[PDB]
C-alpha cells in the first residue's frame, strides 16, 4: 500500500502472490533473493493470504495461489548425498512450507 506522489492518493496494489490468486505463482532463483523477501513469502505461504493493516487502510487479500519454485543449491551443484537442508541456504520453516 502506497501513496502516489502526483495525486496524493492512497492505493494498495496486488502483489505477485495476489496477482496469481486461484492459480500458480512461479518463482525461481530463490537463493538469489534477499532474506526479507523470503520472510514475507514464508508468511504468505502459511496464511495462504495477505492480511494488511497499514496507514489509512485495513483489509485482508486472499492469495490461495500455489507456488512453484526453481532453486539452485549453494555454490555449485549437489555436493554429495549430504542433507538437502545443508545443501541449500533456505530456512527450515520455508522448506517445510
Amino acid at each position: 500500500v502506497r501513496k502516489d506522489p502526483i495525486t496524493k492518493e492512497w492505493t494498495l496494489e496486488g502483489g505477485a502472490l495476489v496477482l496469481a490468486d486461484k492459480g500458480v505463482c512461479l518463482i525461481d532463483e530463490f537463493d538469489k533473493m534477499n532474506d526479507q523477501d523470503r520472510t514475507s513469502i514464508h508468511e504468505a505461504m502459511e496464511q495462504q493470504s495477505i492480511s494488511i493493516s497499514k496507514a489509512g487502510i485495513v483489509t485482508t487479500l486472499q492469495a490461495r495461489c500455489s507456488i512453484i519454485a526453481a532453486a539452485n543449491p549453494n555454490g555449485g551443484r549437489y555436493n554429495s548425498t549430504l542433507p538437502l537442508a545443508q545443501n541449500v541456504s533456505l530456512t527450515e520453516p520455508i522448506l517445510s512450507r
Binding site: N79, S80, T81, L82
Partner: protein, 135 residues
C-alpha cells in the same frame, strides 16, 4: 599386423575372495581419503585418491564394516578369518612387523590394492562408492 601393435609382455582379476571379504576390503579402502574426522559424520547411524594411503587402525575397519554391511550381522569369526586371509594375500598389509600385528600393540593397517580393483569389487558387489568420496 595383429601382433606388431601390442607388447603382449603380460603373462583386475575377479579375486577369489568372498562377500564378507569384498566388504572388508571395500571398507578398509574408505580411509585412503576419509580421515576419522569425517567418518562418524558421513557414516553415522542417524586428491588423496592419488597419494599413498594413510594408515588405518583396527576396530575402525570393523566400525565402517558393520556400518556398510547390507544389525544383520554381528558374528566376527568369519570376519576376522577373512581378514587374516586378506593379510596373507598382502592386500591390506601392516606397516609394523609380521608377527606381532595380531596383538593390539601400536599397529597400523593400510590397503595395497589400487583403485581399479576397487571399482571392480564395488560393481561386482553392486555397492556404490562414488558417494563417500566428495571434493
Amino acid at each position: 599386423i595383429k601382433l606388431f601393435l601390442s607388447t603382449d609382455d603380460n603373462l583386475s582379476q575377479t579375486y577369489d575372495l568372498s562377500i564378507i571379504s569384498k566388504y572388508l576390503l571395500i571398507a578398509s579402502y574408505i580411509c585412503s581419503y576419509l580421515e576419522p574426522r569425517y567418518d562418524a559424520s558421513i557414516f553415522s547411524r542417524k586428491n588423496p585418491r592419488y597419494l599413498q594411503p594413510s594408515l588405518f587402525a583396527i576396530e575402525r575397519l570393523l566400525a565402517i564394516f558393520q556400518a556398510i554391511f547390507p544389525s544383520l550381522m554381528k558374528a566376527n569369526i568369519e570376519v576376522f578369518q577373512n581378514l587374516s586371509e586378506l593379510h596373507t594375500l598382502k592386500l591390506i598389509a601392516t606397516t609394523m612387523n609380521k608377527n606381532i600385528d595380531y596383538l593390539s600393540p601400536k599397529v597400523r593397517w593400510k590397503v595395497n590394492v589400487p583403485w581399479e580393483i576397487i571399482k571392480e569389487i564395488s560393481e561386482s558387489v553392486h555397492f556404490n562408492i562414488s558417494d563417500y568420496f566428495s571434493d
